[PDB]
Amino acid sequence: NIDGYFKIYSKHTPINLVRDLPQGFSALEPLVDLPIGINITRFQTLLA
Amino acid sequence: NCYFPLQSYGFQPTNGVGYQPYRVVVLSFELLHAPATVCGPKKSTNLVKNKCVNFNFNGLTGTGVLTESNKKFLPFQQFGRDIADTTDAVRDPQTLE
Numbered sequence: 001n002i003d004g005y006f007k008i009y010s011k012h013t014p015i016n017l018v019r020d021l022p023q024g025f026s027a028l029e030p031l032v033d034l035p036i037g038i039n040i041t042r043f044q045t046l047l048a
Numbered sequence: 049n050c051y052f053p054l055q056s057y058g059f060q061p062t063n064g065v066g067y068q069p070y071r072v073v074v075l076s077f078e079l080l081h082a083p084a085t086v087c088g089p090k091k092s093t094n095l096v097k098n099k100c101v102n103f104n105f106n107g108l109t110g111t112g113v114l115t116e117s118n119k120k121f122l123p124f125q126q127f128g129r130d131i132a133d134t135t136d137a138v139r140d141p142q143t144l145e
């Protein structure tokens with residue numbers, strides 16, 4: 001969240017893993033950038 | 049000396065020009081302290097190739113000979129930079145090449 005622009009980068013890859021983050025290399029492409037102008041200090045994830 | 053605070057306009061089409069109803073839109077805007085989510089329209093014009101020109105792509109101003117490139121840029125990229133960190137290529141933003 002830089003100068004009020006909220007930037008998101010992301011990647012999807014298919015995997016086959018039990019219980020850890022995989023030892024690999026990937027770059028996140030930018031998908032969206034939203035000029036929201038708000039201060040951010042905390043976050044929380046939303047689960048089903 | 050109790051008065052109801054509101055009254056309604058007697059807007060009749062026979063009213064003298066002035067006692068006639070005249071609509072208003074205040075384009076109010078509060079300006080220039082935060083990132084920009086609205087702008088006036090930025091015009092654009094047809095593409096020339098193999099000629100020397102003063103270019104501008106998406107606000108990238110410069111001067112040069114434009115040519116059809118064989119470079120393939122992934123969809124999130126727009127400017128090409130050389131070993132020198134300098135712009136050597138650009139995506140046309142209307143007819144993506």
Ligand SMILES: *[C@@H]1O[C@H](CO)[C@@H](O[C@@H]2O[C@H](CO)[C@@H](O)[C@H](O)[C@H]2NC(C)=O)[C@H](O)[C@H]1NC(C)=O
Binds near residue numbers: 141142143
């Ligand atoms: C901007 O609009 C033009 C059409 O007005 C789009 O370009 C067209 O693309 C198709 C497929 O290549 C061509 O058959 C048409 O001749 C093109 N139109 C013109 C006038 O050259 C273009 O896709 C639009 N911009 C974006 C980003 O999609």
Ligand SMILES: *[C@@H]1O[C@H](CO)[C@@H](O)[C@H](O)[C@H]1NC(C)=O
Binds near residue numbers: 037038
């Ligand atoms: C963010 O914090 C700064 C400094 O405390 C303040 O001036 C600004 O108004 C705040 N912005 C928002 C959107 O709350």
